[PDB]
Amino acid sequence: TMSFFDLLNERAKRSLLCVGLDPRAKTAAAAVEECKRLIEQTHEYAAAYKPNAAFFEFFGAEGWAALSEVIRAVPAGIPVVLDAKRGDIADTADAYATSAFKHLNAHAITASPYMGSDSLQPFMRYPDKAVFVLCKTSNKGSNDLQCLRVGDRYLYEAVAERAEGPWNVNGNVGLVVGATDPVALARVRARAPTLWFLVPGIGAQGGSLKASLDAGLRADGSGMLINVSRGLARAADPRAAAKELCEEINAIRFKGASVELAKALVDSHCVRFGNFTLKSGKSSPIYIDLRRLVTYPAIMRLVAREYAKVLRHYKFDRIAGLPYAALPIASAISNEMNVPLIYPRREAKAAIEGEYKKGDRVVIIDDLVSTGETKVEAIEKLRSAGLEVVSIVVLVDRDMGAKAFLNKLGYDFEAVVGLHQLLPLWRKSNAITSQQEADVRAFLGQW
Amino acid sequence: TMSFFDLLNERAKRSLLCVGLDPRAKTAAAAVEECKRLIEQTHEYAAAYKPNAAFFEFFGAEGWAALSEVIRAVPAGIPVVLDAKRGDIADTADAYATSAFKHLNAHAITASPYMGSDSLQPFMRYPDKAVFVLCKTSNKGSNDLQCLRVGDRYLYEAVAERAEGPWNVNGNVGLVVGATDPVALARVRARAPTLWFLVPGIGAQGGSLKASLDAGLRADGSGMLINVSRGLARAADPRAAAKELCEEINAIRFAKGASVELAKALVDSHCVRFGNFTLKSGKSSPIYIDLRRLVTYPAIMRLVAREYAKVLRHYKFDRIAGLPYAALPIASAISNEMNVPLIYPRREAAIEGEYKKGDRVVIIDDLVSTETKVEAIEKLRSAGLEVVSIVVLVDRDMGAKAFLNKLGYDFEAVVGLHQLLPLWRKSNAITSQQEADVRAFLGQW
Amino acid sequence: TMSFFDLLNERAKRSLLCVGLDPRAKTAAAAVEECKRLIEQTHEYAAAYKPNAAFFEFFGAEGWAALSEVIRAVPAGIPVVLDAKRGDIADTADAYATSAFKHLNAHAITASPYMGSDSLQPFMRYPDKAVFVLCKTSNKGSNDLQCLRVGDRYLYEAVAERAEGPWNVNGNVGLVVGATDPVALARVRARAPTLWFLVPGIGAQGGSLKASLDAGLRADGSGMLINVSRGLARAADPRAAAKELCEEINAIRFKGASVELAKALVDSHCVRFGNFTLKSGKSSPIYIDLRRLVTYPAIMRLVAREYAKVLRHYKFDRIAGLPYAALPIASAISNEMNVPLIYPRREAKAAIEGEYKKGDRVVIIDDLVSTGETKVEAIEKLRSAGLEVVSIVVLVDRDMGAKAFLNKLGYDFEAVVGLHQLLPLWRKSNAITSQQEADVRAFLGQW
Amino acid sequence: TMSFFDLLNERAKRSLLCVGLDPRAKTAAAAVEECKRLIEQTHEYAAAYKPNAAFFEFFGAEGWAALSEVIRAVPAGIPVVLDAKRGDIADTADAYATSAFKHLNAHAITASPYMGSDSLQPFMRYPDKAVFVLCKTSNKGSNDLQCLRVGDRYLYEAVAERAEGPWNVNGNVGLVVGATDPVALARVRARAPTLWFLVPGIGAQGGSLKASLDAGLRADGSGMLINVSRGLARAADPRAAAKELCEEINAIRFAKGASVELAKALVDSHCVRFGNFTLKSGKSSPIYIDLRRLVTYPAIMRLVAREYAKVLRHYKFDRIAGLPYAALPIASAISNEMNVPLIYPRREAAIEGEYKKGDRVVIIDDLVSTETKVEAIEKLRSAGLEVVSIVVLVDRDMGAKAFLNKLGYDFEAVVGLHQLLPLWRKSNAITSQQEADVRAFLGQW
Ligand SMILES: O=c1ccn([C@@H]2O[C@H](COP(=O)(O)O)[C@@H](O)[C@H]2O)c(=O)[nH]1
Ligand SMILES: O=c1ccn([C@@H]2O[C@H](COP(=O)(O)O)[C@@H](O)[C@H]2O)c(=O)[nH]1
Ligand SMILES: O=c1ccn([C@@H]2O[C@H](COP(=O)(O)O)[C@@H](O)[C@H]2O)c(=O)[nH]1
Ligand SMILES: O=c1ccn([C@@H]2O[C@H](COP(=O)(O)O)[C@@H](O)[C@H]2O)c(=O)[nH]1
Ligand SMILES: O=c1ccn([C@@H]2O[C@H](COP(=O)(O)O)[C@@H](O)[C@H]2O)c(=O)[nH]1
Ligand SMILES: O=c1ccn([C@@H]2O[C@H](COP(=O)(O)O)[C@@H](O)[C@H]2O)c(=O)[nH]1
Ligand SMILES: [Cl-]
Ligand SMILES: [Cl-]
């Protein structure tokens, strides 16, 4: 089995956009049509899909068979949140729970806090499924009841507290916080700093796409499903609209600055252009030589500083820098962090310099990755000598499908910046010519 | 076209029983059959039917057509409460309100208060339909959130306030208050004296029928829908178990005479006290009755009003008149419970309040002995108001009724002094010596 | 002696606007002139004044003598916050503390958290003076350092926590939170729900006058000094600008709704017009008869509900309703709250009905107040029988100077709504004619 | 027109003493006199003067004209650090920056980092002036906020990072790091290898002079302003106490030879180990030196670099060349500390790094015995690079210096094997038997 948050965190590495499936059509058949078409258009950029029962229940009996088809018409990788807003006495709630998880095969459900936790356990007892409790709602008359003071704090805050504490027995509980109220959104994140937030209101209702995000995002730069329903269904080109939102969201979250790094690579003469031939016979118009970094200790300290931001998220004992290029970089990083360095002697009863135990956790540091052929030689030489490779961290990801290769190889990977990300900056800084940019852009389409 | 309450008040003349339709069946077809059977057996004694959507929704596509079938199997005149607990943003809520009222043809719906008034407006705008907002729910986990304090009152008490106030624009807002908590029932009834409650908890959840009614009923003796679902579906004979409940509920509503809790309260409240008092009649008395101090015990003051209302229920009048000072706050308490306008003459121990000439009033006083009631009872009759009756809490059994009838004035008391004797022997409010002395004191008349 | 918060809470009952005195003038003499003129214009509506040392220190020696004159040119009732942003080692900080409190006679100072609490004690040790520590600053580059994560929360939050806990030894500490960042403002209020906030940024810097207030106001609807400096000094009519802000702030805080109450009074035929003569010989065009409320139990329950909002802020044992008009109202209130009622028999060995002990705390409930002549008869009859009068609460304050009379008499007072407040609503609702409004408005100018 | 650092580096050739001017005087006139007296006595040995505004601000109007007078009483060439700790919004900050630089004519100012870079920009835009940002302050309450963790490093360490990085646009950003905490001094020096520190805490606050310098000084032996204020104002003879400090500071900066902490680290780090090793010379040895494993101890690796830099200080070169593998990370550590570009030949046990023909390089290796150094030392000389010297950490005292001089190559070591003997006897890093065997092993040459 796999839980909702397993599936969701996977898509959260890519996007946070949740597609609201709210039919509104001539008939029940028409309703299915619109949705099917809305699924196929958006699925690449969609973190989640959210059918709201109301618009399906509108069509009566034909509407229920309609909801079930639309739910199965979702590719097996985008979690489906049923917006049903259930909440009744345990025994009645049970029937609602089986209907949503066993009959409709939804991965998550919306619910009301009002009837207490014993009304929510019937839904929360499913460890694989998620429950998003209503906290602060997007509607203007939410403050009518939710903004009442329960001594020191508002009611929704009291809800938030309970949602993270007494109720989150097995890490299932999410909260519904509305985008039209950024101030309330921020307060719930202060009360539930860990939880996931289902956030509607963007498009038809209000906005504050940025203000919302600055308010309720976690330390990880994740934990907000931004839901747009009517806004995409009334849109002209849903695929473009979906992409635009996905990107607009991703541009606000995260990198971090990347602008000063871009300069550093150019001030170090690392970026060079021509007809270079890599270890593949195939020629690239651009070559990045981070071996030059050695002649600029100040830039090298900056580079090491960028690596640290990535490496602050992994638990490890030692650093394994791969000579030549990476070894000075790895030395610099080692200095910023105060973590022991290790390095494989470039050859074919250890061939490994430094000091390692057996089964201590290392992170492989390399300069850049194009494909991953080099990254394998190293993982095999290191797991050889009895070391657990945590990940590989790199300054520049050349964007030749290096992540996916390594993932399917087993060990995961992360890069500080991508080649595609650096291009717009260099052009802006006049470091790269118009022809140089489009040449590189064209080269990356092959992959 | 004909309102949910129009229908209900008419059925409520004979029954307050709400037959619940939560079918636990093998298939959706069996569910309809199970419900059909249950409707045919019980309808003569049912005030309303309440199908809970969950159980029909269990069977998906066929299940929904089953819900529609069960609703249309209800005889015209019996209203149908759809228990669906709706609540979302206004735009979404419309689809829920249409579905319930226009497609399914339900007469009312249950709903959550959490999303505020604008979320309930799409339901409440249908004037002919009704909305029961969740207030204090039957489950024990109600205490977990509804019992948080919002200043001086509970959260559900604040929900009660909005329901009976800002939200009841179209006069069609009721409340779901569980039978398992009678303290809650009193407190919601205190905040909402006129609203209908939908009351679940009898049977499967083991609520108390007597305790719920006494705490929960309106002034008019008929503002509660007692819902029973599994208690009837599990019964070997639904028609007889519906009859037994319908009767039991009725005998409690229409019961005439004062309660043990009233009789006890009075002694605790010290409105009736024992001492060695000597009267203007020169003869001494072991007991004195002072309802002046009733103003310090607001909960007792509610009880008193409810007890006055029981009597006042059988009269026809436009307004109530309270006599200052002792009976002004008492009258005000009644005036709240019944929702009838009040009136008072000044300079007692002009007339404020709106009154027209020929209005029918009932005069409220605290006590009647023998002498001072007949004097102020006429400063009102002078203004052209019609005294229907003089109603009092305690009659000292000193020939007031007789004396006032001779003067052509109608009279009635809630409890007589003799009647209190067994009522507070039933709760040990009074000792046997204390009984003997009161009994012997009365023997002189 | 009197503390800063004593003086400030006094003005906070009226306004929250803080006037920034930031000279910017030809000479030091010119600087004094501008400020003197800016003081006289704004003082009625000003909660606080804030000279920022920089603009005075600009003028050197003549600038220091200038600062001191401007500080004394502030009427003895508006607290003066020196924006100096001090913070050094204890021994050096001492000199700065004496310079601000003993030499310049400022009531409060701004300071930096950076050097720890031992650098702030030299300022906090003055129990009469206040200290506003920098938390989240209004400048765009505030996030550069303040928005760093100290595990789970931001740096300014860590500051906020310390400001309310370890540092607030004698209730002196305030926080400087900027108006241009409403989201950060809300988070600091979640970390310091009790503290006072000095809030600049409105006018020249940004805005969000409302968004700011919805974020950082306490449960009491107070605890934010909104500071405008350059915005008022560049303004054409400072007195009008000051009033406009003061009102715009006060209209957002608080009443509460008041709109449904207005209707209720009209639906109850309580508001009547003519040539009425009150217990004073002087004639009023308007008479409000709340004795009619008795014929509308539903409205009476609403009226009682309004009184409760006021009465939720006082600690008391019993309620003393004054017959006739107030006794039914008091009965209704008694019912909403479950508090024992007491009433003085309308006459001249108690003459008081109910049940009271000796020295239990009562609140006098009356219908409306015009002057206060009646409110005295009652306070004297009640303190006679051995009762501590907490306050008097009223539905309608007729606005004939009733508050000030009673205050100077000793017992304080509060009203649910003022006559001036009800007028605009009734006109909007068409309940009052144009001539009726202007007649009443004209009548209230006498007072 | 002439930069604060231009002035300082020139004074720093003879002194690192900063004379502080915090007058505790009866009147403002006495303050000027007190300060004047203090300037005249100390200027010959003062690198900078630092008046703290607080004490001048104490006397209000006259006090400010006193500050201006004291500043203008400083001889031209000696720079003046105004300790005012400024920081507000940019628009306000301008008035503070003008006041300091243009009115008062100070050459640098101290400032808080709390308000971010845009708040410091109004100061930092004056290229000729300098800004000392508060980093780790002298007071014990520094630990209270500056020592909070921001991921993996302290808050002050993050301040250090920004100061030496994003903020030092005009090359005029220094740091205030207190003398009372040498651990902090090392850690800030680690993050900012090139920045000047303003160092308070000597005297009144009882900082350690030796501990502060060793931890705090740059590679060039001259990147610290040692501030003393009350320690000199209270002194009976300022001129002599300034001289005593100026000398003491200098003897520590210019001290030649390896440290006890270096010698000890090596043994702990296990770079020098004792066993029963047998060499290629066939004769056995009780000690072996391997600096390959230096990569696991980054703090030691810093020490090593600082020690290399002490030697390299007296040479003239453009770049440093590191020999892989043992000496590549070592060279990189030096390259960081000194801020000089590095170079390395490949295929060791082409040349990467930018180099032009005729560049002057210093070759860095870990160790020298006798044989393999002379071979790769020429793959560089071949590329047209000029080998100024071959510098090494440990000399085994086996006639390397002599042998290399014969080949016309300049050579130097940080510590010799003989020299280590008393250095780690001074910390018990080695036993007397362990000394005897090493001593006897050397006697063979
Ligand atoms: O607090 C909430 C919870 C859920 N939704 C649901 O999210 C969708 C709003 O998206 P849109 O159509 O306004 O863009 C609707 O289906 C609505 O029912 C809200 O808008 N606010
Ligand atoms: O533009 C490039 C392409 C490749 N490499 C070298 O290629 C090796 C990584 O190859 P791989 O991980 O893609 O197989 C890196 O260590 C790097 O030194 C570069 O330096 N620049
Ligand atoms: O606060 C409430 C609201 C609704 N119900 C409904 O009552 C019906 C069950 O009644 P019974 O099984 O106790 O007879 C169920 O549909 C349940 O949802 C409650 O019990 N308590
Ligand atoms: O975080 C802060 C702290 C203080 N101030 C001060 O408040 C005033 C800003 O008002 P204004 O001129 O921008 O309207 C200035 O004196 C400024 O120094 C800020 O703007 N932001
Ligand atoms: O327009 C008015 C003016 C006065 N009063 C009566 O005046 C008394 C209060 O007078 P005082 O408190 O201003 O002296 C109140 O109890 C109230 O009953 C009114 O009812 N309506
Ligand atoms: O982190 C700091 C920053 C500045 N000072 C300044 O040092 C001067 C006092 O030096 P002394 O009395 O210890 O010699 C004072 O002006 C004080 O403000 C410190 O001691 N520590
Ligand atoms: Cl390489
Ligand atoms: Cl009156």
Side-chain angles (χ1 to χ4, degrees), chain A residues 52 57-58 60-61 64 86-88 92 96 99 103 113-116 118 135 139 141 144 146 148 159 162, chain B residues 52 54 57-58 61 64 85-86 92 96 103 114-118 134-135 137 139 141 145-146 148 162 167:
Chain A
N52 182 258
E57 207 180 318
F58 189 89
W64 258 85
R86 303 307 186 213
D88 205 328
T92 305
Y96 271 135
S99 196
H103 288 65
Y114 193 73
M115 285 179 73
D118 69 350
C135 192
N139 61 312
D144 190 29
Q146 296 154 39
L148 264 46
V159 168
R162 279 153 165 84
Chain B
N52 193 299
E57 238 175 87
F58 197 86
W64 203 99
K85 290 161 195 78
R86 296 312 184 221
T92 297
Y96 269 148
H103 305 333
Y114 194 78
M115 289 193 56
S117 53
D118 59 338
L134 295 167
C135 195
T137 55
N139 54 296
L145 195 76
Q146 306 166 17
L148 286 172
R162 282 153 210 273
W167 299 352

Side-chain angles (χ1 to χ4, degrees), chain D residues 29-32 35 38-39 41-61 63-68 70-101 103-111 113-120 122-124 126-143 145-209 211-221 223-233 235-238 240-268 270-279 282 284-336:
Chain D
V32 187
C35 283
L38 215 42
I39 291 164
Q41 281 282 285
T42 60
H43 79 279
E44 285 177 301
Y45 305 103
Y49 285 90
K50 199 202 82 172
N52 193 299
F55 305 92
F56 294 86
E57 238 175 87
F58 197 86
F59 307 99
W64 203 99
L67 176 61
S68 170
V70 171
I71 288 169
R72 292 176 294 126
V74 180
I78 313 172
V80 178
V81 178
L82 182 72
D83 200 348
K85 290 161 195 78
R86 296 312 184 221
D88 221 291
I89 58 154
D91 293 321
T92 297
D94 293 337
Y96 269 148
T98 305
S99 173
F101 303 140
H103 305 333
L104 289 162
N105 255 82
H107 305 94
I109 194 164
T110 56
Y114 194 78
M115 289 193 56
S117 53
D118 59 338
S119 70
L120 299 159
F123 297 98
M124 289 173 180
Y126 291 80
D128 47 304
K129 309 295 167 193
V131 184
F132 293 89
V133 188
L134 295 167
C135 195
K136 221 278 186 180
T137 55
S138 168
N139 54 296
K140 275 284 269 65
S142 59
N143 306 296
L145 195 76
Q146 306 166 17
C147 283
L148 286 172
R149 308 234 73 176
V150 186
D152 64 334
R153 68 226 191 277
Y154 292 109
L155 166 64
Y156 68 87
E157 282 189 295
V159 175
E161 289 179 340
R162 282 153 210 273
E164 94 122 39
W167 299 352
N168 207 17
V169 171
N170 295 349
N172 58 353
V173 174
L175 285 163
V176 180
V177 194
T180 51
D181 193 356
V183 190
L185 261 165
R187 259 189 239 265
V188 181
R189 188 41 84 196
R191 305 312 173 102
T194 71
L195 295 200
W196 268 90
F197 301 167
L198 177 55
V199 188
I202 293 97
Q205 306 187 262
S208 172
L209 188 55
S212 287
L213 283 162
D214 284 325
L217 286 164
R218 283 192 299 203
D220 52 46
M224 280 180 74
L225 252 189
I226 304 296
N227 174 257
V228 188
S229 80
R230 282 172 293 186
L232 281 169
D237 183 355
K243 187 179 164 75
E244 203 185 334
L245 277 153
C246 182
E247 285 185 43
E248 193 171 333
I249 294 160
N250 288 359
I252 296 164
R253 310 157 70 189
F254 305 131
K256 95 87 225 161
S259 67
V260 168
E261 18 284 320
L262 189 276
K264 187 189 168 58
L266 264 45
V267 179
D268 286 332
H270 289 284
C271 293
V272 286
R273 45 190 188 142
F274 302 86
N276 293 293
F277 323 103
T278 169
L279 311 145
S284 53
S285 162
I287 190 178
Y288 192 89
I289 312 155
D290 178 67
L291 302 159
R292 278 170 191 186
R293 51 160 55 80
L294 235 179
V295 289
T296 104
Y297 311 94
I300 287 88
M301 187 64 121
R302 275 183 228 107
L303 253 156
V304 169
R306 313 254 296 167
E307 293 283 37
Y308 267 92
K310 263 199 186 63
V311 177
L312 293 166
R313 177 189 298 187
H314 311 118
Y315 288 98
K316 180 173 73 70
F317 56 94
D318 303 275
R319 303 203 152 87
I320 71 166
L323 309 186
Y325 294 104
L328 191 45
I330 306 172
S332 273
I334 303 156
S335 173
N336 202 258

Side-chain angles (χ1 to χ4, degrees), chain A residues 22 24 50 52 55 83 134 136-138 176 200-202 204 227-229 231, chain B residues 88-89 92 115:
Chain A
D22 300 359
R24 321 202 199 219
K50 198 211 69 185
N52 182 258
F55 306 98
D83 202 342
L134 303 180
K136 182 80 171 57
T137 56
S138 70
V176 184
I202 297 162
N227 177 285
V228 178
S229 318
Chain B
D88 221 291
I89 58 154
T92 297
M115 289 193 56

Side-chain angles (χ1 to χ4, degrees), chain B residues 344 346 351-354, chain C residues 265 268-273 276 286-296 325 329 367-368 395-396 398:
Chain B
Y344 56 95
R346 318 226 304 179
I351 293 159
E352 305 299 337
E354 292 177 356
Chain C
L265 271 22
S268 302
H269 313 283
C270 293
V271 281
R272 305 205 76 89
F273 295 91
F276 305 86
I286 191 172
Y287 193 89
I288 300 162
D289 190 19
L290 298 167
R291 295 162 188 86
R292 284 186 172 79
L293 287 175
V294 127
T295 183
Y296 302 97
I329 301 168
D367 55 339
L368 58 85
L395 217 203
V396 179
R398 266 175 132 282

